[PDB]
């Protein structure tokens, strides 16, 4: 009889940077997933391994709601089997991903005359992330053969970089808010359900 807090996720005032993506575990509640798939406000709604039209008949042990902002051209990177700086260095989904990637344009909320530079991504990393791994390290990345010793310089780059979200950006460079819903059924009571589950 407890309603799942999906509204907190989708209707948050500000979203996370992608390198510091947000995660909320959701269980012990009932959810009306139609509020999501009956909507016209989403630009993309790519589900993998499960039909959203059949979620209202199903129970799971956990639903994970990750959320963050990327630029438009990078929205396609939020999917299994993708290669790029977002999938490799910021947010990575497993090959057997089971959930939905729901994204919408947020240029009116996250861009600004003069530019909003408060959204960041990781540009450099020594290796690719594991699925659902987060990295908020700020060590100096050694790009060449010379050690850095924690000071910026030649071939020694700060690993985080800002999106420059101005309202006049092309749509590929405009901010998009992204929610990722993951569904998992462990050897435990399945407590997050649709109304008919």
């Amino acid at each position, epitope marked *: 009889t407890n309603l799942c807090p999906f509204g907190e996720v989708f209707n948050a005032t500000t979203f996370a940077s992608v390198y510091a993506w947000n995660r909320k575990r959701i269980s012990n509640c009932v959810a009306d997933y139609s509020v999501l798939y009956n909507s016209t406000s989403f630009s993309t709604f790519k589900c993998y391994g499960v039909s*959203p039209t059949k979620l209202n008949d199903l129970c799971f042990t956990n639903v994970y709601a990750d959320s963050f902002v990327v630029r438009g051209d990078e929205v396609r990177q939020i999917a299994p089997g993708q290669t790029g700086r977002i999938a490799g260095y910021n947010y990575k989904l497993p090959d057997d991903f089971t959930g939905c990637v729901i994204a919408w344009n947020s240029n009116n909320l996250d861009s600004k005359v003069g530019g909003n530079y408060n959204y960041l991504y990781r540009l450099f990393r020594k290796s690719n992330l594991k699925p659902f791994e987060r990295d908020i390290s700020t060590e100096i990345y050694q790009a060449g053969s010379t050690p850095c010793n924690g000071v910026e310089g030649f071939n020694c780059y700060f690993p985080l970089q800002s999106y420059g979200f101005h309202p006049t950006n092309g749509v590929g460079y405009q901010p998009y808010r992204v929610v990722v819903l993951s*569904f998992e059924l462990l050897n435990a009571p399945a407590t997050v359900c649709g109304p008919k589950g």
Partner: antibody, heavy 119, light 114 residues
């Protein structure tokens, strides 16, 4: 639910180009991926490829990659399957089928477009 | 690519008796996230598009009569019609949607035995 309506019967000469369509109507079309299936006369079902209209991500079967173009107009909820130069061996019935995601069953089917290629 | 082989190719059973179709995949089709096998069964009658009968190996689609049941695991799956009725004469296909490219079984024709 969801309904898929395909274009009409086609009768073409070899070498001619062709584009057949498939339109969705119903609730939550944004969740839907549209794939194409070939059925030659008296034969079984061959999956050709699939597209997500929202961003036009398109995947082809290796048996059919290079032979056709699958596309979509998201402003009219329509997916397309097209050839540039038909052969008589393209004669078959083609179904579009939808599922509300990748790695999902094909739970909605069009009525099929019969394509006869002959001189 | 995952390959599906159905057996038998044809099947004749009397009215009210049980029909059994088998599907063997060259690879397992199990998602560990939710412990489901990504195998579906379709029915096709002449002049009509295929109709989805069963998904996730053993779940019946809405409105599908209880005569049809899906079974199996790993690489071995089975569609079972517990008591055939005249409207069950048709070609039945299995299909894997574990990953693209999606692949079908060759189909099994089911006729009334005489």
């Amino acid at each position: 639910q969801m309904q898929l309506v395909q274009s009409g019967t086609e009768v073409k000469k070899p070498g001619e180009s062709l584009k057949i369509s498939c339109k969705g109507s119903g609730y939550g079309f944004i969740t839907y991926w549209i794939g194409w299936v070939r059925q030659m006369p008296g034969k079984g079902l061959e999956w050709m490829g699939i597209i997500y209209p929202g961003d036009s991500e398109t995947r082809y079967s290796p048996s059919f990659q290079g032979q056709v173009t699958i596309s979509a107009d998201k402003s009219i909820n329509t997916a397309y399957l097209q050839w540039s130069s038909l052969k008589a061996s393209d004669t078959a019935i083609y179904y579009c089928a939808g599922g509300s995601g990748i790695s999902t069953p094909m739970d909605v089917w069009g009525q099929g477009t019969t394509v006869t290629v002959s001189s | 690519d995952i390959q599906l082989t159905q057996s038998p190719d044809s099947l004749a059973v009397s009215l009210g008796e049980r029909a059994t179709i088998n599907c063997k995949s060259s690879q397992s089709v199990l998602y560990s996230s939710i412990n489901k096998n990504y195998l579906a069964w379709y029915q096709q009658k002449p002049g009509q598009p295929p109709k989805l009968l069963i998904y996730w190996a053993s779940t019946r689609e809405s409105g599908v009569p209880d005569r049809f049941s899906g079974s199996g695991s790993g690489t071995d799956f089975t569609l079972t019609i517990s008591s055939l009725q005249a409207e069950d004469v048709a070609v039945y296909y299995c299909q894997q949607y574990y990953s693209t490219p999606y692949t079908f079984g060759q189909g099994t024709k089911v006729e009334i035995k005489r």
